[PDB]
Amino acid sequence: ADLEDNWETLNDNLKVIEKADNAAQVKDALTKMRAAALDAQKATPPKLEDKSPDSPEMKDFRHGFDILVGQIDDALKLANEGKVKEAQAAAEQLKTTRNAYIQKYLPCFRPTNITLEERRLIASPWFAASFCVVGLASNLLALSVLAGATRSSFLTFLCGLVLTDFLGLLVTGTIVVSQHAALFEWHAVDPGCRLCRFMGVVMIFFGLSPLLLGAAMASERYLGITRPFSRPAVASQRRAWATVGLVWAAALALGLLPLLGVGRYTVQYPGSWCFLTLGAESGDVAFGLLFSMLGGLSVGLSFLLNTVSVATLCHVYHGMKKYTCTVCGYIYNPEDGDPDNGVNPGTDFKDIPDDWVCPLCGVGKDQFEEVEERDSEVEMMAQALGIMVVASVCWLPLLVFIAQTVLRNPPAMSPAGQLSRTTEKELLIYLRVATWNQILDPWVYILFRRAVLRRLQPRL
Ligand SMILES: O=C(O)CCn1c2c(c3ccccc31)C[C@H](NS(=O)(=O)c1ccc(F)cc1)CC2
Ligand SMILES: CC(C)CCC[C@@H](C)[C@H]1CC[C@H]2[C@@H]3CC=C4C[C@@H](O)CC[C@]4(C)[C@H]3CC[C@]12C
Ligand SMILES: [Zn+2]
Prior knowledge:
This protein is mostly helical. It has helices at residues 3-19, 23-41, 56-80, 84-92, 94-101, 116-122, 125-147, 153-181, 186-189, 194-226, 234-255, 257-260, 282-316, 375-407, 421-447, 450-454, and strands spanning 265-268, 273-276, 323-325, 331-332, 368-370.
């Protein structure tokens, strides 16, 4: 069987000896442990794949189980000699040796060339905690100033983004801080592989969600500015919240792919976080590219839609009084007229006769609305730009790096799962750069407001 299964069998039976009241029930738990230890001895741990069956690393691996079986047999002798508390004492020693001989070989853990000294130097739980507190305080501030500001689709997406950033920092931040406080010894926080896999799912979820929500904001702006105006309705707010839920569900489904067998979550340098494995295996390539293509496309789509929206706002919030066809969105521009249909440039919409129709869809003047300049639309366009700039600067270096690592001609990662120290050190840098998106998205909303500008112009 798999190492993880034998590991579970071992722990399940350790709690059994712990609760146990007689020698016979301690004996059965100890017998199951011996079979699980002998079973685990035959296993090939992924971090020893390139190593030959008779290599030093494999000899030390198989030897660990001789030590475990020897400790099981020492507790079995104690149980067969009727001594209950003596066999429970010798069995509790296996909780320490299971960490030495099983824990480090679990699928979470790839091989690393990090020393105990390098770990003591990087470990900074107070720096990390302070930095999370700043991020959470920023997101609580945005939510607070959003509460005092009604049924808009843009603010719905923005509220989704702030709640995602806040929660992201809280969940992943507390795992990061715990790992720094434990000097990156995962067994101290959670023995086994469960916390690591939870960390990975939640890293993808809170990595993809702000990016997808940023693209949702660019889409709302584009449809809102290009198509005729519609007063923020309860239905539009409802539709925007349903969309935030679909985005969250899509980001969650994506994070669950390694649990379904597409990709894999492993502990990453310095040992404070888990993420997709930057390997050359089919699943590592597919999941790594799926994550980077999804994030890349979100930022790219945001760029395309925002440039069209800014250009539309500029052209529309200047010049003569414009009118839009509330059927196709055609904008009657007095500067141009409609000369092929008798309207020379300069003709104000009011001077166009009753029997003129839209040159795009052919409906009458009755279907035309005045294009009204709203400061709120400018405020929202500025905020959508701020969010797009923040995701470009913070998320793109990481997204490009993931895709580049996963696609490297000679593989970036060894068969055992080892990356070079420079690859690990860069991944940490880009991951740290990406964290700032969760800290800065609330500030774009806090700072890019008319009230902030009105209280800055005289104070500058
Ligand atoms: O140990 C490290 O330095 C990397 C961990 N890193 C990280 C955080 C942090 C907070 C303070 C100091 C270092 C930190 C907190 C940070 N959470 S997050 O911004 O919500 C986020 C970022 C990237 C991501 F893919 C998914 C979620 C995860 C990475
Ligand atoms: C658990 C995760 C994956 C998804 C949960 C989010 C979805 C299903 C839920 C939770 C909160 C909900 C929204 C809360 C706020 C509003 C505003 C109101 O005017 C109409 C309902 C509406 C629009 C709700 C629609 C659906 C909603 C977005
Ligand atoms: Zn028309």
